[PDB]
């Protein structure tokens, strides 16, 4: 993460899909190195089906030669997240900021 930054670090990191952003806000049910489960808040939850938003993270897989693309969870178990939070950094992102 750049100690010397400009502010756009989030906007660049978030808008390219290399990270994993919260569909809906809630609390984390389970945090693996593999996946992440967010128990949806009722206000953001749809009437039928109920459900929980589950994000399966990308793990060590090949890019367009020869580099790698692997995501890491950046929330700890039982942590409140809101809509638009970063659930998992990607390559060259730390806590949702562009770290090239």
């Amino acid at each position: 993460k750049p100690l010397v930054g400009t502010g756009m670090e989030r906007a660049v990191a978030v808008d390219s899909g290399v990270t994993a952003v919260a569909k809906r806000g809630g609390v984390v049910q389970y945090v693996d190195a593999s996946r992440i489960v967010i128990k949806v808040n009722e206000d953001e939850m749809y009437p039928g089906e109920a459900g929980i938003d589950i994000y399966n993270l990308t793990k060590y897989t090949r890019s367009n030669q020869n580099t790698c693309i692997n995501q890491m969870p950046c929330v700890s178990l039982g942590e409140p997240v809101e809509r638009g939070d970063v659930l998992a950094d990607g390559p060259s992102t730390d806590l949702g900021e562009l770290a090239l």
């Binding site: 693996d32 190195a33 793990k59 890491m72 700890s76 178990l77």
Partner: protein
């Protein structure tokens, strides 16, 4: 003709920080020995960190373990920072077993008699699931300098065990050394120098023995100059 020094006060703060005084030094010898000791301390000091780790289910550092939020090479990176001091053994193998929704610290390793853990709070990995099982063999050995894992697979001669995660080993117990030379007054002797070496360790090696071995090395290298 020439006055020779000795180590006086060795004031210790944290287990990781220390300040060693060297008191009967001549003019120019504060800095002559201070640097040439800082140079030895940082580079060539014996210590032990972890060399190889076998994880139960994992086949290689680029896997995932259900129930752990750390990637395997993030867990291997946690072990590289495991500060162990072992006594009469040159290489020892530890066993780590822990399950439940708890962070697995360095106190959770099975304790051998010859083995001492310096940071029991040190984090190895976390466990997210309820009944999420983890067990590993961690192989520590004493070593000098910085030995990468890349240079370890030349001898090899059947290290085939597909689940033996080789890790990089940074064996130096010295983290940082500074030496400040200030004047010393010892009753009569117009001007002498007090040499203060200040050093940070990983806890494995104590300061006094480090300096002793630092200057021991120095005497041995000059043996090729005592004659030709």
């Amino acid at each position: 003709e020439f006055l020779k020094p000795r180590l006086v006060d060795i004031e210790q703060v944290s287990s990781t920080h220390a300040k060693v005084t060297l008191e009967p030094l001549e003019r120019g010898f504060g800095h002559t020995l201070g640097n040439a000791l800082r140079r030895i301390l940082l580079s060539s000091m014996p210590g032990c960190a972890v060399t190889e780790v076998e994880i139960d289910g994992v086949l290689h550092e680029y896997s995932t373990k259900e129930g752990v939020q750390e990637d395997i090479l993030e867990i291997l990176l946690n072990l590289k920072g495991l500060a162990v001091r072992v006594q009469g053994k040159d290489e020892v193998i530890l066993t780590l077993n822990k399950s439940g929704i708890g962070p697995v610290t360095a106190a959770d390793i099975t304790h051998d008699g010859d083995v001492e853990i310096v940071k029991p709070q040190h984090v190895i990995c976390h466990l997210t699931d309820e009944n999420a099982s983890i067990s590993m063999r961690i192989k520590v050995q004493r070593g000098r300098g910085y030995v990468p894992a890349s240079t370890r697979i030349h001898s090899e001669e059947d290290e085939r065990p597909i689940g033996r995660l080789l890790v990089d080993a940074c064996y130096s117990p010295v983290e940082r050394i500074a030496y400040n030379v200030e004047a010393a007054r010892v009753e009569q002797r117009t001007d002498l120098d007090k040499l203060v070496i200040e050093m940070e360790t990983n806890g494995t090696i104590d300061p006094e023995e480090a300096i002793r071995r630092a200057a021991t090395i120095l005497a041995e290298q000059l043996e090729a100059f005592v004659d030709l």
